Structure formats: structure tokens, C-alpha cells
PDB file of C-alpha atoms in Angstrom:
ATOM      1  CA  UNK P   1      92.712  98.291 117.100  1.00 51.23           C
ATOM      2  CA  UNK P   2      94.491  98.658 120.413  1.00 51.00           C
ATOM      3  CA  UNK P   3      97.835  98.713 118.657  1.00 50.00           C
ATOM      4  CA  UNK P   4      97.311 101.260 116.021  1.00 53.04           C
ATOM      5  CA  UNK P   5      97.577  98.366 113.056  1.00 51.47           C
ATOM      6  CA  UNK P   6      94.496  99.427 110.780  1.00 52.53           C
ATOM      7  CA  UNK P   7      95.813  97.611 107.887  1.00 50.96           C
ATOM      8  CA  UNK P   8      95.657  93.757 106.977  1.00 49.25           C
ATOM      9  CA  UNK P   9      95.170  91.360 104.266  1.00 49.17           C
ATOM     10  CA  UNK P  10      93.726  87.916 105.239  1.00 48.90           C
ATOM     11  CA  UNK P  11      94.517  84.755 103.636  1.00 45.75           C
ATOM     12  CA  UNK P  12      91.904  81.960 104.074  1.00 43.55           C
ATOM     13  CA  UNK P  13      92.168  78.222 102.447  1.00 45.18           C
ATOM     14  CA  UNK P  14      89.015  76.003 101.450  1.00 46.21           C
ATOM     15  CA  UNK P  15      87.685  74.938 105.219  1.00 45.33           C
ATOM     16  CA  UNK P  16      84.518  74.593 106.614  1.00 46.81           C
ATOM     17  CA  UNK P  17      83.106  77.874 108.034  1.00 47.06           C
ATOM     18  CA  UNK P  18      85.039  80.452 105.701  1.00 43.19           C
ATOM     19  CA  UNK P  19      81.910  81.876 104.397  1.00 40.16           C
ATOM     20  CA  UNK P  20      80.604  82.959 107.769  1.00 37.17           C
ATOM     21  CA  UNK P  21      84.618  84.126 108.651  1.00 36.61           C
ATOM     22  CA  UNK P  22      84.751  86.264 105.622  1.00 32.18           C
ATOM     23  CA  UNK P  23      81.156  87.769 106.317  1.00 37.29           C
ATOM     24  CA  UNK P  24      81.542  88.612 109.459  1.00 38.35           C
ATOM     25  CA  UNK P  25      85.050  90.372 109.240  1.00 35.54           C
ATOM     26  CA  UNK P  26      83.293  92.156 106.024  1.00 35.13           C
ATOM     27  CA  UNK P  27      79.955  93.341 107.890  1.00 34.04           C
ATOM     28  CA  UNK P  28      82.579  94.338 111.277  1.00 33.19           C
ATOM     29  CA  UNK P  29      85.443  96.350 109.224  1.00 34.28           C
ATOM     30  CA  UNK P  30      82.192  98.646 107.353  1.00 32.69           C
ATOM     31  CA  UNK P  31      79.894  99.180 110.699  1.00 31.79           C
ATOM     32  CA  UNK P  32      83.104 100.454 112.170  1.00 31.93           C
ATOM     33  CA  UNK P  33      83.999 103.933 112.726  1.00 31.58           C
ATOM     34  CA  UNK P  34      87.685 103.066 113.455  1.00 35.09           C
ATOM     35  CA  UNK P  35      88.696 103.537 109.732  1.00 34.27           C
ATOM     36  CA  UNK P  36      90.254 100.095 109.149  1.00 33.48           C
ATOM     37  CA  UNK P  37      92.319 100.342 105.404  1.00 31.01           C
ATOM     38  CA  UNK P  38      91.193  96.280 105.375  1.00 32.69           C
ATOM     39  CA  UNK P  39      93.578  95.450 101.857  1.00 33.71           C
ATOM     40  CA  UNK P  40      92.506  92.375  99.313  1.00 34.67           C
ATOM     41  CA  UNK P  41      91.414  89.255 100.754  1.00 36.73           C
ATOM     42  CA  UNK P  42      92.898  85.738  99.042  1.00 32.47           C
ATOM     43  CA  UNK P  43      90.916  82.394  98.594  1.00 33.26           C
ATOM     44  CA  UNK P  44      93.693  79.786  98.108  1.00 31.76           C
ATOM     45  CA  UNK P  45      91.506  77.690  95.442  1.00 32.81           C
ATOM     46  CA  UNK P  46      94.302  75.269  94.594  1.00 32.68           C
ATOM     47  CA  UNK P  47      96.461  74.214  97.894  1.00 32.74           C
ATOM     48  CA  UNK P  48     100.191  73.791  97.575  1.00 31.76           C
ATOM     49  CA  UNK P  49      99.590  74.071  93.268  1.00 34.84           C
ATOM     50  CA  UNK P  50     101.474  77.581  93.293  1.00 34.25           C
ATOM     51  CA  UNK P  51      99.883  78.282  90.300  1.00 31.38           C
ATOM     52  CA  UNK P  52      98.079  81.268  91.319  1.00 30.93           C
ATOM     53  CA  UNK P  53      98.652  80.404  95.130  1.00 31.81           C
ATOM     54  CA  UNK P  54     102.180  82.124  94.794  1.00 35.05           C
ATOM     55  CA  UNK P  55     101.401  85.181  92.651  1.00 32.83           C
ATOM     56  CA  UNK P  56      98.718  85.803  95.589  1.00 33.57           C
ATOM     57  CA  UNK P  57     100.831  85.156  98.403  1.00 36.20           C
ATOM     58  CA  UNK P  58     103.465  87.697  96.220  1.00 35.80           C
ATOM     59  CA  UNK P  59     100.720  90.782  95.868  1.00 34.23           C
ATOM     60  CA  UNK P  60     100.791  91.434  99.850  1.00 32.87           C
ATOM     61  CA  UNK P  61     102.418  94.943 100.631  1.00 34.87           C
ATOM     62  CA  UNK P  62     101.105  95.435 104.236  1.00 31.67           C
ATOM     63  CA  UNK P  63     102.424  93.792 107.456  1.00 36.59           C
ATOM     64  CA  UNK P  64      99.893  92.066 108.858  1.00 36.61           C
ATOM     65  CA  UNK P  65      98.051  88.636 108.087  1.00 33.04           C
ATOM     66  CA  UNK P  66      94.758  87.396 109.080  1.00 32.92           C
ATOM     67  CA  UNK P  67      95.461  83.609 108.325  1.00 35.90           C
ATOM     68  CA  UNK P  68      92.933  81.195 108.566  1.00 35.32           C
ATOM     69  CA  UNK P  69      92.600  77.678 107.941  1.00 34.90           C
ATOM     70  CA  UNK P  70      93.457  74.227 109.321  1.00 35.55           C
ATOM     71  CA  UNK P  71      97.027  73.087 111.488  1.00 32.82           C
ATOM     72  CA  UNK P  72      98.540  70.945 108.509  1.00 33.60           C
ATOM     73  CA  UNK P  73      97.455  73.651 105.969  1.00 33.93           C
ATOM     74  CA  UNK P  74      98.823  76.701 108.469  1.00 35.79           C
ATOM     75  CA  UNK P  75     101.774  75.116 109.277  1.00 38.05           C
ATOM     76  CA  UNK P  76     102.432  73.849 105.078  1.00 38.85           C
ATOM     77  CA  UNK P  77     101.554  78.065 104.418  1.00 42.88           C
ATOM     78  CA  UNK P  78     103.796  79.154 106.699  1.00 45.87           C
ATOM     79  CA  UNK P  79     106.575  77.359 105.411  1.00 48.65           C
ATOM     80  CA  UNK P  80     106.225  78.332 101.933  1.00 48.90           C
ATOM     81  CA  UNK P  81     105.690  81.714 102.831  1.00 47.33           C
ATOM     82  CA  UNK P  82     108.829  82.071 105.247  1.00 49.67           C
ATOM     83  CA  UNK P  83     110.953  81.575 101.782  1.00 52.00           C
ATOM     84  CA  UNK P  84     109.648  84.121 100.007  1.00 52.42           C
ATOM     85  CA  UNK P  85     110.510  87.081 102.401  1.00 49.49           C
ATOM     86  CA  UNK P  86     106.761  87.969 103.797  1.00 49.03           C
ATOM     87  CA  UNK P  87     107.814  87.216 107.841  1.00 49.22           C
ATOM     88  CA  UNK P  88     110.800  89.132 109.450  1.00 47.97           C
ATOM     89  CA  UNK P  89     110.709  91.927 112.598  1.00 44.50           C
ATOM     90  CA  UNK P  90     107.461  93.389 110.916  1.00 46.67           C
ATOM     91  CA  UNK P  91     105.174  91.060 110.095  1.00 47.67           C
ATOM     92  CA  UNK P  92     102.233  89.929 112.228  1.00 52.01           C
ATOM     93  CA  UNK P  93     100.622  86.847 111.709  1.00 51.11           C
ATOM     94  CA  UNK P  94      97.231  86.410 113.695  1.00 51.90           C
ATOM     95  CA  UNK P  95      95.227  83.112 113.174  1.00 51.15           C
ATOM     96  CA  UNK P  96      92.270  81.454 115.164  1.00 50.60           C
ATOM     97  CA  UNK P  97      92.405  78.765 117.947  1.00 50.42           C
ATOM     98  CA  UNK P  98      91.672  76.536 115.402  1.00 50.86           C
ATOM     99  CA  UNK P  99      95.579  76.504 115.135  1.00 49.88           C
ATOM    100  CA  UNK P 100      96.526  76.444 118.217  1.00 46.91           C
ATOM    101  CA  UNK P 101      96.045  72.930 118.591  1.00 44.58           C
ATOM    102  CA  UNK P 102      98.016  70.901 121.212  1.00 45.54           C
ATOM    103  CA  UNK P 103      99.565  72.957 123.480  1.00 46.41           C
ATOM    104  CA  UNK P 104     103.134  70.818 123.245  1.00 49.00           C
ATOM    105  CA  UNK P 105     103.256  70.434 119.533  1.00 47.41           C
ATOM    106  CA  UNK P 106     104.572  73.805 118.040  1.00 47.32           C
ATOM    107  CA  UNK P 107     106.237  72.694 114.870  1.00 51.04           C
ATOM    108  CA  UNK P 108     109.610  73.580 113.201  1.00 50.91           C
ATOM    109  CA  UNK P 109     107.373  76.043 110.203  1.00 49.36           C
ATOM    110  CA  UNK P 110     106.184  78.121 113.174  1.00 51.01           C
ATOM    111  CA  UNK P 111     107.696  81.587 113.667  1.00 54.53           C
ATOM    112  CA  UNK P 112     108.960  82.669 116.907  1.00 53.66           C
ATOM    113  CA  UNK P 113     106.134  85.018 118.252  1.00 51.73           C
ATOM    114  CA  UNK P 114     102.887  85.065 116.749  1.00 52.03           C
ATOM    115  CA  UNK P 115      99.177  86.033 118.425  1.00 53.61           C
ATOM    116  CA  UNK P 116      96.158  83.940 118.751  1.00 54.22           C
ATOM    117  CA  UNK P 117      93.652  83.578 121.306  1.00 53.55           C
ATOM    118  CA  UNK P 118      92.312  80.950 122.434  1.00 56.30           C
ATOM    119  CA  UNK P 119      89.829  79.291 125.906  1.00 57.74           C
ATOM    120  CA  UNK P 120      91.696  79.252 128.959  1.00 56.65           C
ATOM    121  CA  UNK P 121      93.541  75.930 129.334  1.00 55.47           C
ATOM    122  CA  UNK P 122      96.453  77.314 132.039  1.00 56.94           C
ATOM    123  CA  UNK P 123      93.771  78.711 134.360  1.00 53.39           C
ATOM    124  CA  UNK P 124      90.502  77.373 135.250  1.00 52.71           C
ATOM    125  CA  UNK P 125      91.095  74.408 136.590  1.00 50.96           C
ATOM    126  CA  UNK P 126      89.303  71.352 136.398  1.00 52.77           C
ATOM    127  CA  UNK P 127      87.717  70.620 139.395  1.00 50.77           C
ATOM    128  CA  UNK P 128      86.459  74.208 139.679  1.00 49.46           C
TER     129      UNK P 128
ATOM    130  CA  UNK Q   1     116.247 103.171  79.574  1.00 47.79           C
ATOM    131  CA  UNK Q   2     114.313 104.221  75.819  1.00 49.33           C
ATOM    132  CA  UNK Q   3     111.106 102.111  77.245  1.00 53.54           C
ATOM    133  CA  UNK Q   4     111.531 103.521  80.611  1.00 54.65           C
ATOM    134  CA  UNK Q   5     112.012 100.743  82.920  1.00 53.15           C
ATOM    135  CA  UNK Q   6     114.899 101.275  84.914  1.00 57.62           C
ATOM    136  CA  UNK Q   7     114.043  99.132  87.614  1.00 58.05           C
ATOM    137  CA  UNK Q   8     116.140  95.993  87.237  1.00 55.97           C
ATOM    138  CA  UNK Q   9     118.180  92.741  88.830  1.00 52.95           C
ATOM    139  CA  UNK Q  10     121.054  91.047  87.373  1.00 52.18           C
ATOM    140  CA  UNK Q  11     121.142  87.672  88.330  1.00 49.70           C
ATOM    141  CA  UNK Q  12     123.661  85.606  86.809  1.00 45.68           C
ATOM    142  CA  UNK Q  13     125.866  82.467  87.816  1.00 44.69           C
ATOM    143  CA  UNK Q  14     129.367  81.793  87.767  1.00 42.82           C
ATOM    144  CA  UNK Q  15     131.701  82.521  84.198  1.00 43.15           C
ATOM    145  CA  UNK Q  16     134.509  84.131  82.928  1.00 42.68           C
ATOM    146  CA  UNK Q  17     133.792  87.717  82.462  1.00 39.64           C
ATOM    147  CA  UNK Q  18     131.058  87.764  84.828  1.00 41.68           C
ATOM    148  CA  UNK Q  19     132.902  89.967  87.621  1.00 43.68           C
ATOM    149  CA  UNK Q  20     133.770  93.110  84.636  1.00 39.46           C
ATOM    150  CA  UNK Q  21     130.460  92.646  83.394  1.00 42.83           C
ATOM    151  CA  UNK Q  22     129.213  93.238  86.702  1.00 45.83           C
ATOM    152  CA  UNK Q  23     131.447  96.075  87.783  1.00 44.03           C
ATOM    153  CA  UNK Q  24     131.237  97.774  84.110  1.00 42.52           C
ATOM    154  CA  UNK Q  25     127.200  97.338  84.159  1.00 40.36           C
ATOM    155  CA  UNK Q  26     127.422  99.155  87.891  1.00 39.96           C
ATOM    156  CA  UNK Q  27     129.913 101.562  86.947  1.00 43.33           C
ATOM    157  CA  UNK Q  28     127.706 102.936  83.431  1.00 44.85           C
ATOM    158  CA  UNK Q  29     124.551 102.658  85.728  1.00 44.24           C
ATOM    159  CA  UNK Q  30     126.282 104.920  88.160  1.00 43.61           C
ATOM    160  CA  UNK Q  31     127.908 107.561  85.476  1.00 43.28           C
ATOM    161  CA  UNK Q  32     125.001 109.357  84.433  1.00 43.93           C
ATOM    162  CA  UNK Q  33     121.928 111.152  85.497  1.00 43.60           C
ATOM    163  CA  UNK Q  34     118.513 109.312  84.929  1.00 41.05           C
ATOM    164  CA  UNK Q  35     118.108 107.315  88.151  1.00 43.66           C
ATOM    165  CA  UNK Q  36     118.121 103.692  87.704  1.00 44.05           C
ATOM    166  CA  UNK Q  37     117.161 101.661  90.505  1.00 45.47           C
ATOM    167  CA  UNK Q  38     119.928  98.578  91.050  1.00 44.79           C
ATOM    168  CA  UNK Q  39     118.759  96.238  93.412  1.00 45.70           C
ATOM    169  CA  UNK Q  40     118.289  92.214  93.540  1.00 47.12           C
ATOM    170  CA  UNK Q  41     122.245  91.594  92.087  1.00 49.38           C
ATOM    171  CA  UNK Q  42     122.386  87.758  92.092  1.00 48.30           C
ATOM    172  CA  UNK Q  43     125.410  85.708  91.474  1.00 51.52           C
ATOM    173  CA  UNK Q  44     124.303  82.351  92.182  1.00 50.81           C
ATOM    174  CA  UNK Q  45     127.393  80.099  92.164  1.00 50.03           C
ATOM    175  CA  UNK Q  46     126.244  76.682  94.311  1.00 48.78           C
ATOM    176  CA  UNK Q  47     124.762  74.431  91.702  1.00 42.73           C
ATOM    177  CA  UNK Q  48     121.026  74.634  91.765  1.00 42.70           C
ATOM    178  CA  UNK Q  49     119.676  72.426  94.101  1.00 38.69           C
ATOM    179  CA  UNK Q  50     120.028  74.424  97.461  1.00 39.43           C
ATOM    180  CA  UNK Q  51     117.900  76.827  99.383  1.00 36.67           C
ATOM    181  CA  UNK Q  52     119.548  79.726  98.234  1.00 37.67           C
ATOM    182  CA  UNK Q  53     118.974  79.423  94.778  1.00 41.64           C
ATOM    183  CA  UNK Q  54     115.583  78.992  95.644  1.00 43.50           C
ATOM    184  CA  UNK Q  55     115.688  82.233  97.994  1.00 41.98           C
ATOM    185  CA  UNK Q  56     117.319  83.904  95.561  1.00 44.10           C
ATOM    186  CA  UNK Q  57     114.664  83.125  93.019  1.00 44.96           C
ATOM    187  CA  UNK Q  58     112.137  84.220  95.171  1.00 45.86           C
ATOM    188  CA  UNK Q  59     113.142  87.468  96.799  1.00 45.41           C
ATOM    189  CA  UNK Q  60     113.187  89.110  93.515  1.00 43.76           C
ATOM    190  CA  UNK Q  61     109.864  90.913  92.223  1.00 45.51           C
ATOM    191  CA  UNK Q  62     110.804  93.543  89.442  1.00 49.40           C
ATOM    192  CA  UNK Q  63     109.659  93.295  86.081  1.00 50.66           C
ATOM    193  CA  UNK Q  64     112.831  93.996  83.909  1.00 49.25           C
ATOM    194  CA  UNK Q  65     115.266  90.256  84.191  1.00 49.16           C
ATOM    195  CA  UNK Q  66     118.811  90.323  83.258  1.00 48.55           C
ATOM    196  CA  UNK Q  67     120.449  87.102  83.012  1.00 46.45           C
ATOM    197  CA  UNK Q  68     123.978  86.085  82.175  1.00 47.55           C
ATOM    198  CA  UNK Q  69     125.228  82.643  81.398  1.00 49.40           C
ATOM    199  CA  UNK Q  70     126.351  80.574  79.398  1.00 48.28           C
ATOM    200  CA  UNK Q  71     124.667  78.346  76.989  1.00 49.19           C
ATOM    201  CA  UNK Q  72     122.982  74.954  79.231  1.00 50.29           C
ATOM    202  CA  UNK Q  73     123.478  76.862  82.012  1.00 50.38           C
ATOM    203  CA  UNK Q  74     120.558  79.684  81.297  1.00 49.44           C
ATOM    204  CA  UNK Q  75     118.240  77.027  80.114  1.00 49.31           C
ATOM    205  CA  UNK Q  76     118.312  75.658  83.098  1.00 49.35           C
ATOM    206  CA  UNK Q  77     118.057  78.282  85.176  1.00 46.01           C
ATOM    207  CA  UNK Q  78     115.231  79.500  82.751  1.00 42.85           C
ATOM    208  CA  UNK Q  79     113.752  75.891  83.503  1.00 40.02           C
ATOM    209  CA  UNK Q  80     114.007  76.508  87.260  1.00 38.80           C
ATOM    210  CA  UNK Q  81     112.376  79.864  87.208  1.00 35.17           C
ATOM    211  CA  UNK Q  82     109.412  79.268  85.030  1.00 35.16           C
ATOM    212  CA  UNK Q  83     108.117  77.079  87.859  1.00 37.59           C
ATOM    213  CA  UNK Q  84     107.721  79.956  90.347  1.00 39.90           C
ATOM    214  CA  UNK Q  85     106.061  82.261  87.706  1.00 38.65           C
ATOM    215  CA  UNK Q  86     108.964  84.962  87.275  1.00 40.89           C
ATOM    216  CA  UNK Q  87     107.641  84.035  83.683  1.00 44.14           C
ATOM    217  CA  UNK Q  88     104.088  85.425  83.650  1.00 46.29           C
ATOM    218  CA  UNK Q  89     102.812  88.153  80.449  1.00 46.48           C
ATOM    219  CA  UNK Q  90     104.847  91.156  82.318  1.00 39.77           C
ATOM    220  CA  UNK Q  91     108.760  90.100  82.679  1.00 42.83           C
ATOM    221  CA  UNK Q  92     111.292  90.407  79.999  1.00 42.16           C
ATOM    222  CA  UNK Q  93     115.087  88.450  79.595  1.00 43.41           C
ATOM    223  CA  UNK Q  94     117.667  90.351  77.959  1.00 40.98           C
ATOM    224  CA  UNK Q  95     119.960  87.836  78.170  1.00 39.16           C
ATOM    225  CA  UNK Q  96     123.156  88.652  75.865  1.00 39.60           C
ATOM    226  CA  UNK Q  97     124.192  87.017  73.262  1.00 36.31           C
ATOM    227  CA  UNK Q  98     125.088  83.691  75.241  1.00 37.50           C
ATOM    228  CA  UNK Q  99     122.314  81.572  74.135  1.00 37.41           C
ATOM    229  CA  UNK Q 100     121.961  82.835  70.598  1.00 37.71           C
ATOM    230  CA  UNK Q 101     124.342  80.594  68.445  1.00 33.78           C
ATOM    231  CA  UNK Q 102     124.319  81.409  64.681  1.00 28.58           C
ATOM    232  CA  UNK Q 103     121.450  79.850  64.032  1.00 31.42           C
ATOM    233  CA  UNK Q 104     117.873  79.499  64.936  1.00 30.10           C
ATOM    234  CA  UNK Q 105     118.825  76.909  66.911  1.00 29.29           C
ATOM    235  CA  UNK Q 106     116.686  78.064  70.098  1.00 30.90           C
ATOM    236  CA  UNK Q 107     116.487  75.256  73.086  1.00 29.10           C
ATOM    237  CA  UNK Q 108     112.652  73.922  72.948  1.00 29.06           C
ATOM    238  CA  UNK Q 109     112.462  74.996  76.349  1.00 30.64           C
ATOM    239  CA  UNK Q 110     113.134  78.629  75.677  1.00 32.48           C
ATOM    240  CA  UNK Q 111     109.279  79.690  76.407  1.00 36.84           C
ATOM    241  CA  UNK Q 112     109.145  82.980  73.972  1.00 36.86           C
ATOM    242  CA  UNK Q 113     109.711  86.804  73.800  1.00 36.91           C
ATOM    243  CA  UNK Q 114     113.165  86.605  74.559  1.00 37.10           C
ATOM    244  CA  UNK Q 115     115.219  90.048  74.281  1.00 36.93           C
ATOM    245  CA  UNK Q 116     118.759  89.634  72.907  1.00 35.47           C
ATOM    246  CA  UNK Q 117     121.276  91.514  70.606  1.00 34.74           C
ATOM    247  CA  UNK Q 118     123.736  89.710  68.535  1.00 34.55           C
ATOM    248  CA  UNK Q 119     125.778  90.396  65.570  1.00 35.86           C
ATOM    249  CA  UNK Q 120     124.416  91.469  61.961  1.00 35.65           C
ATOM    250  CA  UNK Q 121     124.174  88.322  59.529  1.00 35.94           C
ATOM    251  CA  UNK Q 122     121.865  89.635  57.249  1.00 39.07           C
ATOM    252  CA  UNK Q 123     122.480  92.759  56.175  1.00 37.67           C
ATOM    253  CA  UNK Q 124     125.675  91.963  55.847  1.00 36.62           C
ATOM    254  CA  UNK Q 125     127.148  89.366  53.742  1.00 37.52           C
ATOM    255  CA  UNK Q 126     130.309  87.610  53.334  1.00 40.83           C
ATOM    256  CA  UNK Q 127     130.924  88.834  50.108  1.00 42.51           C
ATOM    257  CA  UNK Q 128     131.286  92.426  51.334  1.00 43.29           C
TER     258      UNK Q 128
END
């Protein structure tokens, strides 16, 4: 909301804690007075099958994509999705810290500049 | 243009007659006033085991198909593109003449509905 983006489509993949994700983001986006335009979500039921997984991933006109799901599974998404035209100057992935996993291991599927939060690792320092 | 569908891409591969085909099909398209949409021109020439016959595949989403090649060569690339769903219950081929031999002599792999126009056989006999 602090950019002036009210429009996504999330795309979420069979992982534990979904149900409470897709909840949530449906009781926030309603009790809001923001006027989100929140677009179709997609449940991946068949990973990698591209059976309906494609078509899906095809039927996504806006710019920006609440992914989320596991590293492997983000980072084998990501990939597929890269060839078929949906990341470029305009499109803004956001995902949980959940992906953000090691903080030396981006991989080669990963997009240069892409937003998710996660604790503070560089600050707060151990001792303290 | 009498089913209103205007929207189109012309992928083909590499053949004689491919580069007037291309320039006449522009040309008519251009020479009249109706508005079709030309976009997604694809003249895949690099085998078909790159990435850019697999980008190529993907980046186009329009309904209306038309192919032109010649003979093993569309089958294939019919092959090829039924696995990433360009083949669903709302695309058409108008592929011309080509793969139509004087028979119905079809490959097995041609899936169905298959728009052509060929050459009158039947209402026409040799003995007129």
C-alpha cells in the first residue's frame, strides 16, 4: 500500500500453512478500506505437471505476484515462469522469508531485485 | 475475417516461398480497412531443440494459429506445441495446403479440427 500497487494475484503451491496464508490475506484485503483490486488466486495442485499449472501461470494480466511456497519449489517456479514472459522491468515478485533461506545461496533462477522481508540477521548482534 | 477473429500470429519455419508468403500475407493485411491485429510473426529456423523455439512457443497467447511448413516438419512442430497446451478447445490451425496430400492420409498425430483449403477432387472429375 505504500507504493500505490493495489493489484496482485498470488500463486501458492501445496505447503504446510497455506490455508491460514490464504485466510488471512482474504479476511485483511475485505476489512480494508484501502480498495485493494486483489485478482484470482492459483493453487498449483500438480507441481512441475504443466497440465493446468501453465494455463494458470498464463491467465495473470497484472504485475505483481504474491508467491508463496518452499526454496526448491520457488526457485523451480521462477524458472519456468521467466520463459514465458511474466518477469521484465514491471513485474514484482514478493514472497515470504520462508525463501529467503541462506543468506549466500541466491541461485541462478532468481531475478535481479525482488522484495521479501525477513528477521534481522545484519543487525542485532549476537552477544546483545 | 467472416468469423471475426482478426487477431493472429504466423509462425512458420524455414522453406521456399516462405519470405513472399510472408511479405504478401503483410502486404493484403495492410491494404484494406478492417483492422487486423499482426503481432507474434515467428520464423523459427534453428532446429527445434533450443531455447528459442521454446520462447517462441511460449510468448504467443492469441487464439487464431497460422502455421506454414512443410509436410514432417508441421507435425513436428504440432508435436512440440501440443505439450505446452497452445492446443486446448479454443485455438484453430489453418495451416495451407502443406500437410494435406491427396488423400486422407492425415499423420496419427494430427490431434483434430484442423482448418485447411485444398483443391476440388470431388466435384470435379477427371472426366470433365
Amino acid at each position: 500500500q505504500d507504493y500505490d500497487w493495489h493489484v496482485f494475484s498470488l500463486v501458492t503451491t501445496i505447503f504446510p500453512g497455506y490455508r491460514e496464508f490464504i485466510s488471512f490475506v482474504k479476511t485483511t484485503v475485505d476489512n480494508s478500506f484501502v480498495g485493494w483490486d486483489m485478482q484470482n488466486v492459483i493453487t498449483l495442485d500438480t507441481s512441475f505437471e504443466d497440465a493446468k499449472t501453465q494455463v494458470q501461470l498464463k491467465k495473470i494480466h497484472s504485475s505483481v505476484i504474491l508467491l508463496y511456497c518452499s526454496k526448491d519449489e520457488a526457485v523451480l517456479i521462477l524458472s519456468e515462469a521467466r520463459s514465458l514472459g511474466l518477469t521484465g522491468y514491471d513485474f514484482f515478485w514478493i514472497v515470504p522469508s520462508l525463501v529467503s533461506g541462506n543468506t549466500e545461496l541466491i541461485p541462478k533462477e532468481f531475478p535481479s531485485g525482488l522484495i521479501s522481508v525477513s528477521y534481522d540477521d545484519w543487525d542485532y548482534s549476537l552477544e546483545a
